[PDB]
Amino acid sequence: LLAEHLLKPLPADKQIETGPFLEAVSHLPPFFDCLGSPVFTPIKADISGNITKIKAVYDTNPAKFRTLQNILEVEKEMYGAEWPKVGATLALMWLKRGLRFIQVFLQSICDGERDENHPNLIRVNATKAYEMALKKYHGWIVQKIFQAALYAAPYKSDFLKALSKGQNVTEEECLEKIRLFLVNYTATIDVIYEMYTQMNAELNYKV
Template sequence: MRSHWSKRRGAELGVGALPGRPPPPQSPLSRGAVRGERSGATPVMALLLEHEFKPLPADKQIETLPFLEAVAHLPPFFDCLGTPIVYSPVKADLTGNIKKIRAVYDSNPAKFKTLQNILEVEKELHGSAWPKTGATLALMWLKRGLKFILVLLQSISDGERDEEHPNLIRVNALKAYEIALKKYHGWMLQKLFTGSVYALPYKSDLLKALEKGKEVKEEESIEKIHQFVTRVTPILDAIYEMYTKMNAELSYKA
């Protein structure tokens, strides 16, 4: 999802998703065998709602520690999408970016109390190398990964679907990728992600995975998704606005 997820890695992982070599179709049984359904584990959606993001203050200054504590529970979401060969690196990059930001914060909690503090201090510290360095770069890619998750979940919550195949989430995943990540990826990664949608679980299996295999009515799962998206969207919008105002957004392709 970020620059470290290189074309080389895409070539290694995405052979089956290259033009002319689509991933083999999966049976409903294999689609349902998504990760994250261990009995006794806390459901992903429960974690996301329990460790919710703090409401956005009027000055839009986002406190670093509460933000990091909330996003720390996002990586397991990618286990629910199955296809480890594609989404495990995405999960690893998301986790790595969170750790990099946390390391900067821990070096001086008072100095880096807010996300804006981090960008301002690093801008002065790194000079011409900024913003393509440090926690500024890590947060840039983290927000894109978060946006992918939010757009995907929002699309499912809104009922967007392929009318001929209503239980598939390809439409939702492709929309999320187009909006959040595609323009930052080179040709190889674009083909890898586009091909990966054919191996995504059914919507019913995704919702079940988000609940760790527990039987929950679809309406209840959708309502939890709506609550999560509603809480996080203002935070994410404020981060994007901060990057725009500080000219910290980069458009290079990974």
């Protein structure tokens, strides 16, 4: 899945380019097929959702929107007091919290975080990724959903196995494959988070 479509390394000036960024992340939603139960299908559709809205905006004037920063700043002027709860800016605001979940989730598995009593489960890693990436932005109902949903969770091994289908590589080799992917993935997500902060564009509302 992930380490064929590696993420371009972070540029000097820290300016992510929309087009290629979208090409790269448009590869992550099938992530969720590895999770292996159609419960998760709607999450996946939600993120694809975001990626498309961004790609739409971008496609409308690829020069005006060469970078992600260009998207945020151009929309800020363009829409109202409405901003940033509008347009691609909103799409990204959320997309990034999905990317982060993935990001923290993989890292956790990659770091031998486990439940000493039940090593082959993913609760504690999903939960930690959920704690840090989405929980702040979800009401009680939704976490009650997240909570059920954590029973569609596959076994850890079965994820990995599945997360590297065919390919042909130890569980171990598999984890390094991630550890490399994670380097740029993480650098990138952190810039996007920076960007949002510096442009007062994060919103704290819940769902």
